[model samples]
Target: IDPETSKYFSEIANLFDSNEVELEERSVICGNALEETRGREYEIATDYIISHVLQTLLEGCELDQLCSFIRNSASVFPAIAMDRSGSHVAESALKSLATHLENPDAYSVIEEALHSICKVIVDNPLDMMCNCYGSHVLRRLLCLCKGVPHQGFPGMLTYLLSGLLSCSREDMKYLQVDQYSSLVLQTALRLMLKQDEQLLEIIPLILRCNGFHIETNVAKEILESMKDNSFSHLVEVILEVAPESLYNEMFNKVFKNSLFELSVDRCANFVIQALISHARDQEQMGIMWEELAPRFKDLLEQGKSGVVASLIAVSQRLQSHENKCCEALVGAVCSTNESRISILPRLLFLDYYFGCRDKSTWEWAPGAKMHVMGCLILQGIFKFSSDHIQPYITSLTSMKAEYITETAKDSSGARVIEAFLASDAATKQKRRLIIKLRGHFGELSLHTSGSFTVEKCFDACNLTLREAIASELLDVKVDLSKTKQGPYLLRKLDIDGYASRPDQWKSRQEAKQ
Candidate 1:
């Protein structure tokens, strides 16, 4: 804790972070030298301030050396599972070893450490998985555990996940509601694909406890789990990796009847989206479209605009209901042909849409930060086919020039403009938007955020429009040259080399085709 110990500790750290071959090798030798420091290694590694130093030490560790730290630290792993300082060292130490899981020899070393750690684990394993700090460290172990054999393994983390199946249905309900256990619970499910043989056996705790198919097809227990804020995340992961047969039953029996109801539940809303994202085919998609599409305005008004966006993106991804998705989305945001003329502004300003008590007079204010979700939604739809997206293209091109500059000036705003330019929309659709920015290119070229959109514009526009932008930028050459991006933009337009000479610029341009 004093300055002298710190001086040497820092010497070890400097070598580790060092780039030189010799000094980097010295760090490993120096760290291995600390291996026999008895209990002090554990103490320092678990210290709030000094643990990070140990983390880097673990980072540089090779196969056997990392294993010994795992072995030596076994006794404290459970206690450190919840220690803010200790959990980090244990987590870092476990992660350092877990990377070697693919190496066959690495498995034996990890097995030995797991046994040593498990031999001392106290009876109340709840302390390891139900505490905040404990849950994450335990999650890392669970991932590691999955990669290795668990048959008759009587090991750490194996029991924490598997013992749940033996829990009475009542107990499983309470455990799933615990935010900590629920999180620890889901981490095990992520591996169902990779750790297929074993997870297929363990995750069936849901099927057994919910009686999902043991009797009637309906299982309110499974529905109840989906409605829990904490438990819903686990079920989402479950559905994410659920086998198609299981996915079918859950979709048909549970979510189908309660579609709109769950879509509005803050927790279950996410679960609904996960199910939508994983629908196996068009029939499943059709069932979802039936229940969810007509209710788009209801979802939008409730600030569940994201569900609507997911529905549209998923429709495109599955290649189903293209026209219906566009119609539902536009219908939710606009009521009539006149309203459709300003659909771009309304989608960008949905926060304004939801905030306005009356939409009949809602007009977009110039600089209100565009509703971020709507902007993200808009970017995705531009990838829809030309005919489908043409209405939006018209709306965007028709927005006032001053308004386009204002939107492009923002970092988030610039990204949407960039996505549209790079999207599959026809060249003229892109040109329509870029042409409006001709005079404003000089202003945009000088801004940090706007400069990015201006660069995209340069790439998407043709040689003729390119010359217009180059000339507009030259008019302000002295001032533009001093900005951060001016040098790059000037080089792009050749405004300096032959840019100052239009005839030479035209020759290079005419060579294009």
Candidate 2:
């Protein structure tokens, strides 16, 4: 929009419309404009000119000239391929090549351009893959390579796959998790998925690629990939056909340390559960349990129930040592006890002592915030510290009603309450909570967090207690409906057939009269 830039753009537009102007001359003008305007205020100007140049070439029926310039100016093509303005032009050129197969000469032109673009991609994959514009060029080029026999395309794919297989921690870090660059790595795996043999080879390469022995970057990638449904399905397929040799390598390297991390992840837990499901016999089962046992204290105290339950279920079929591990697990949960459970509020709501630090030396920094895993640990305590630990069970059950009420007001805290309410405590112990929860029905019914606990209490309580809690809400029905939380709870009651109000009874009386 600056006057000089505006005039420069106008002149390029003029060149595009003039059939009198040579194609090569126009191409050079566009390329030089791109090189000259590489930074700051001129960036938008470059993209503007690049878009018009490519648009003119395509619209003017000059595919030969477009391909020719891309090939001849190959040295600057990478910068062009990565340029905000120029990369779109480059991708458009590749797409144009795709439609010209009927003419052998045109097809050969497409191939030469394809080879050059692929060469640029291969030469600086990391650089190009990270670029906002360059990444799409590479992706578009890969899609174009589907029907063609470009030698460089497959070689570029192999180089990316080789990056994974190299097992260099530094490079693996980028390929696995770099926000932009990971696209190329993922694209390589997707392309390889077309062949079972190719997939089989690539699967183990991914498994071993992240320096699995003494580090967790690869394990994190597996977890990260598991978050993607398509990639997860591919991983699941690969696991089904993977050799036992790879399984053992995965077991020793990836699964060993990741159990706790995976168990706590919302997505990664599925991968962990699926991996455990594939345990062929006692040996494999034992290997997994052993990985868990050292983390027993943490696992029982923090591991998600889905993971803990899976571990327990798998141990049942392991033939021996099942009870020992089971009892040790129970002991771990009960022994860590109520102190840690009470800390949940401070840790969560207040961020008190949330992260790792020296007990005497360090202060809480912003970076030291607690994570989801901490909430899982708190829930684990409430979940597994059963009636067997009578004193602590009694202590938690007899905790201040207001404390339980307050705790139930939070999402994570509600889960802990649900777990405790659902545990195998004595009827008397359970009633203590039911009694405390009764007067809070109106508040709880409408509460986002407390509403869940209100419903779970119905499941755990007998009809009398259910009626009492329902009636408690009825007493405050008008008040409940006035607030946001009450309507959802009332709807749930109607759906579940809990009669919290007397509207139907009033109708029955009228009918009788």
Candidate 3:
């Protein structure tokens, strides 16, 4: 409330909005930043001034003046683009161009400027990729060019691919691995997927790349990435457009390692599922099934226990052989001395990530549920086979309650328990399983994998078992609300009339221990 200080602040604020003053003054500030200047001599001033100019243009701008400045300052545009403040200005300029594309008169000037800016990007593709600031400008351009009908799109793709393919092996590795540049590679791959001619050319190029040698098999690398939810979308995109012949060749190569080996690979199995789903015809489908059929028992025994179940859903041949598939799954479950496979390869968590393998190993996280692969096989068998696999229910429930609880704690294992509860088994048998879970409600509800089963238990059981399980979860739901999986259980309990109201549950305001 100091009068002098308040007045000074108001006066300073006027400079940004002073249309009453002059245009040359604003242009001079913007122009000086774009001028050929050496190291930090004008870095602060230019970044500061240009950022404001860009900020002002978001509303609308003097198109000719902006375009004229860009034309005259073309030489230093690259350097400006690489500056912290300067790259933002370049991005704004592209956005401004995109905004004006609707107006024919404004678009003429905008189109010329875009061509000039894109040419700079093309000529300095590597520099743009290397510059932390400039690389973002390229990514923005890639997004902006999508379906724009701008003449520069093909050239942009060409220049990006040229830079990628022509780089040294060392540089190529960097391009593939660097987070900044890796996006550009993905953008390139996206563009190539849009056209068939490009697709034909790009496939061979990817095969010859350093990481994708005949011995290494790039398919495996991509498949491994697909296991994690993060990068799966990208691999999914590639497979959608990749040729059928490529699928055949990839499967043939992968099978050389044996169908059982490929099926066991936690990551590779997903890719196989994708390939089978995308098979072009009945013959190709039949061929894939035939190649994979001999490994049926092995697949069910390995981590792909569920994958084999899924395969049955897709293939009539597998359906016709349902009896065999069902028997194989049952045998796998029975073969385990402890009546359950001790460990299942958690599909969501892979030993190999991206291009690296786990060189070190340790136990699963505390309170983390172990997913038994055999449990998954049992779940799959129940899902696909209507035959009387329920007799094995006795074998499953006969195991120690500790094993059942541990399996129930697993995400996939939770599904097995859910399937068993929902299956056409005797109500008494299902009740027994629910009764066993009564004491473990707290541990199960707090678990990432087990929380789901905890919810399903309420739905599948009678009122008595539900209240018993609910009574156990009630004590923990207050404390459980603070943990990651705990809140979900609390919410489910809230919805199903087992816990406090939703708002009261979340807003308890109790301090944690």
Candidate 4:
């Protein structure tokens, strides 16, 4: 420290401690010293001046006054972060709030200062100052609230939750997936758990996230399991509104190499438990059964074959009539064709069209909306082409259901999926149209939502395949035109090595814009 600056700071410090100095005169002196520290070289060190001011405020400042000081004095904290001065003073002020919080009036005082800090850090999340120490500082304040019952400050808690969740959600939803969301989610869960009943009330709000970011799932279940008075109603809303993607991820895991991930098993169980809790609602139960049976099949495949009996047991218990439930169980078992022998009917159904224009329902019905989007954008070519498929294609365009409408929206990929699905030429002409559509998507993901590559991305690869088929179809247009019978033409095309192109389609798009 400069000796002159040190001498100046000592004089200001004396004024702050003197009984004869009026508060207004001291404020003027502090303001002048702060200005000198900013406008020119000052003998007084900036942090020393800031600390003298902070100490004066904390000595006996009113709640509103503390808030004003915090707002006005925040620049000093960042300057401290910049100049690498003693943050110990700021840290000490924070610690005093926690330790003295038991004072009848101190909670509100600290709250005002803390709220200002929260807003500052939230707005400047990535600023070097906050990035370095702000989160840690806020984390300490939250830790102080750990054992205290939340009597009326839910807004403060919500602000903190939003900041933490926003950071993680931004990373996952906009960029690459990582464990950051998981970590932030863990913090929120721990904090919410500390808040008791407040955790339950906050969860439903979190579950409404649009994408499949795992933290959203974690938040949903944490709120779901809190066994409070409102659990039933909140849980009911989750069952009814939660998207099928949750079930798809979980159930698919049990049957395939994975369904619900081990980390998110609670999310899977939340869905299962929600279904069981509402088992009496047959209509809802039926939807649950439709989603559950496949997942139950996943469980059986996971070497938990013994659970097959229990799976049937849940279905039976869910049913109003045991025999009807028994029949449904039998149908579920028979309908779930995991084995090659059982898969033959599904293969046969590929050729069996209900009629022209009903293509979406033929085999991919109910769930094919996502499949059509995925296969069309991720894979190559319109695999399920037929003259009769047009109506289903149009119906697919009209689909607005949450879980089933991934491809219908007018966004780039959705438009790409829509373009090809709605294409109406014969297989050969359709082939060319499909390529143009795929190229449209391939170029699209490369330009927008670069979540995948042109060739590796599903939508892009699908477009590539469509492109190749369009080329070949144009080449073999005469041969394709010779036969309008969709199955036989596709069969001959397959036999003549044309099928190689479909299988050759590869993922080329998997990056973000």
Candidate 5:
């Protein structure tokens, strides 16, 4: 009740205690008062009267007398005796003791009541649904521990995970919808890191709960957390039992083929890279590389054509250890004549080898051009010889005179060759080619410049790029006029095929012969 109601209710109780009228007269007066208030301000009057009655008993009555009055109020009406409303009324009576609850006796009573409620969860975790009323009462009791400390709070999370994991497969289906799977595993990861023993007590339960229905991000989180302090020791202890535990096994399975095969978005190629970094086991690393190489080839086979470009980015950052393992896959990519030619630009972007710099037109198999260059250049990076360099130089120069033009759309296998040129290029000849190619490609401003076709744009761009590179502070241009294009020409032909019609517009489908 509001303050106004409380004051009015107090007045009614005062009238009872006042003794200003006879008992029969008092009954008549109270009855008439009720009758008059009912019609005009019915709700306000009833609430006010109840409030004053409560305020009177709370301030004036002794505790024992207060109990007796409550008992009599319930008994006077059978409906009141069995109703839940009385329980709220009893709570209200205690609420009036707010000021006194700070007192020792009142504090004790409040503590005891809370203790009784807490006992419900501690004693019976499942009996709450015995009936509708039981469920309501249990929820109310659970509310008592809302901010309770760890020791005082009910242990609900482990039980929740347990229930989800131990349930049948069909029931497990619901977990994905409610996000129960992610939540349970994430919560377990959090707890497992902070409270090792607590998790040890529930590890088997967690493993059981390990339904495939669990979100991949949640699994990633768990794997990430295993690197933490508390669980690191546990991980070591577990591995002591089975030293050959392949940590990357899960990730390898997720990316068995190309990105198209990745059923879950959260477990992507980058995440697989992360998994590789996490696995420190030598055996696991070997297993991982062996499995990873074939799968990468499978991905190329499956046609996630962008992967080669992504691999180039990875190649830049990989340490010497990974380079050795990756060399084999890179080698196979150089040799694979069977994969699509459409993937050449992406492969060249990866810098596997130097390629044709004089394409006047587009070719679908930019990757093939790159492959041809790699077959020749791999010997240079690893087995440099005048014979290889001499012939490649000859072939490159011949292709240049026949096909060379400043254009960005050249897929004659140019970029890979350009990368190697850029590396040792500090020469006038290299600068000229750089200027030549820049005229074609321009600074790629937009992802795909819809307005400008790549061939036309490249022709327009190389002239401006030459001027830009020339204006730079460094004296950087290589005097290509003096460098013989013959040796490079022969070297190129030894490995790559040359186009008879350099300016002809054709597709990989047309070049099949």
Candidate 6:
């Protein structure tokens, strides 16, 4: 039964892969094949190999054709949504349906399909809720319905939302933690009521959560049940849009006592990071700061720099604990007071620092991993009060020019230099850093990543320095300007203009300042 269906569908799938076939012609083939399958949708949908071919067909078919295919396959959708291989087919179809969401005519076609799929999912809510495959389809469905106007089909949308949110609050305690159902719940909690009214009535009924529900111990239990990785993601989103008073309760009761541990857990550390960013006010951040800032050294030892990095970012945001956070990072990344001079470089290559776990002896050799998070931390560090960050500015400018060039060559590392160029550091250190990177401007300009750093360096310079850098760039003109960043660098750096009219470049530079 399946071999013929499998081979037959694969032929159509192969046509989509052919260079000779236009998408219009391929869409025609899919339209024909979908019609040929007629009422035999379920068996073909369940065949493991052919399921993907079916998906490829649905994915490539025209909107009206896809709309008809979904409407026609309504009977097989239950098994399709539940089957391991076919579930992806269900997802692929739903994805295609979502692409046409804004089409005025699509609303009529999609509304019917949504009703059929929603009806089957609610038949045995728990079965689909925790189902390995079924839960995925539900998440996509949850997203799909969110795009449809709340008033699109009130009769069906209401039935769908209510039926999906049908489980009792007691059942939710388990469902929120139940590996599979928890994901759907997360998607709903994230997408459902976020300034949208699609699932407005249903979510409140399901969670018994109104704007701010403090009467119940719901927030307390939600915080206490932070033992699971899946549950941790839920709380991460919960914090972003949560009310301040609830954040206070959840933070004070469960999180602060365990801040040291939460910041170290593989999963809960992310939750801790979110709590840091979303803390209501400076007083709240101050509590987290006192708890975690002292343990920065220990957190570094455990390879939990993300926690360290987050605190650095929010410290800048809240404008509290700036010096203490800086001092903590210095102590965390530096094993000796002497090594504190390389603090900027230590952070630029933090992955290496963490791996070697020795700050003093861990030096930057060629090919060190310039961790992006470390670069982001460095970016944040510079944004702090210039009065305090002044020492690190000298530390960076005093480094050998070769290391500055190396840092600018990589994409993430370039950002650190770009950050420094725009930071509170004075023109003296900035000029010293620019002059150090002088000989490498051409190489930096041609580099895919380094070109960005080159632009920032160019912008930081006065007309005199900009003219000198432009002179070096023209000295090494390349046919390799055809590469990714090459052409843009040539034009933006005004290489041709520099060669043609050096006087015009001076006038333009003079006018800008």
Residue range 86-121, candidate 3, lDDT tens digits: 777777766765665555566456656656766666
Q: Candidate 2: where is the Cα deviation over 4 Å?
A: 1-126, 130-196, 204-245, 253-281, 288-292, 295-371, 377-398, 419-432, 474-486, 495-513
- Predict model 3's lDDT versus the native: 0.56
Candidate 4: what lDDT?
Answer: 0.40
Per-residue alpha-carbon lDDT of candidate 6 for residues 1-513, written as tens digits (9 for 90 to 100): 557766778887776777688868887887788876678777777777777788878877888788787787776776778889878888988898887877777777778778777777677677677889988988888777776663245455456656766777777667767878778777766654444444345434444454434344665675567767777876776666555565675677567678887788888888888888887688777888888988988886676778887888888778788998887788777767687788877778776767775445766858665888888888888888677676578778888988888888878888888888888788878999999988888788777778788778888888888998888878767742767877787788788888899898788877766
What is candidate 4's lDDT per residue for 1-513, written digit by digit as tens?
Answer: 556765776776676667787776655655455443443221122355555544443444344444454556564554433233334445544565555556666667666767776675556443322333433444454555452664234566677556644544344332112222223333445565434345444443444344344354554444343333233333334444334454333223222222233212433434344444434445544544454455543542342322233333444455433333333333332353332222212211222322226533343333332222222221122222334233334333333333222332223335444444344434443333333333243233323222122222222233446345334444544454454342243343242343354344222111221
Candidate ranking under TM-score, highest first, comes to: 6, 1, 3, 2, 4, 5
Candidates 4 and 5 compared: the better one by lDDT is: 4
How would you encode candidate 5's per-residue C-alpha lDDT over 1-513 as one tens digit per residue?
456645655677678788786655654444443332232222332242363444334344444433333333422211221124433333343344333433555444444444433343334323222223333333333333221342223344343334334544443333222332333333334443434445444443332224123245644544544424333333333322211222333434333343233312233433443444445445544544455455555554443323332332333334223454334445444444333232323243333322335332333243123343332232232222222233233333333421333112333243434433434322444444444443332222111321122222222333334234222201211221123442232222211122343223223213423
> How would you encode candidate 2's per-residue C-alpha lDDT over 366-415 as one tens digit per residue?
32333344444344444443533344355456657776676566566677
As a whole number from 0 to 100, the lDDT of residue 68 in candidate 3 is 59
Please state the error at residue 330 of candidate 3 in Å: 6.6
* Local distance difference test, each candidate: 0.74, 0.57, 0.56, 0.40, 0.35, 0.76
Per-residue CA lDDT of model 1 for 165-244, tens digit only, reads: 45666666676778887887787777555454555666567444342343343267777667788878878888888766
RMSD of each: 4.9, 11.1, 10.6, 20.3, 21.8, 3.8
Compute the lDDT of residue 74 as modeled in candidate 4: 60
For model 6, the superposed segments whose C-alpha errors exceed 4 Å read 2-39, 56-76, 148-165, 168-171, 196-224, 335-337, 354-363
Output the lDDT of residue 265, model 3.
66
Off by over 4 Å in 5: 1-203, 209-277, 292-296, 303-321, 336-513
TM-score for each model: 0.81, 0.51, 0.53, 0.32, 0.31, 0.85
Q: How far is candidate 4 from the true structure (C-alpha RMSD, Å)?
A: 20.3
Selected candidate, larger lDDT, 3 vs 5:
3
Worst 10 residues of 6 by lDDT: 206-215
What TM-score does structure 1 among the candidates reach? 0.81
Model 3 regions more than 4 Å off:
1-114, 123-140, 147-183, 191-237, 243-398, 410-430, 446-451, 473-513
Worst 10 residues of 1 by lDDT: 209-218
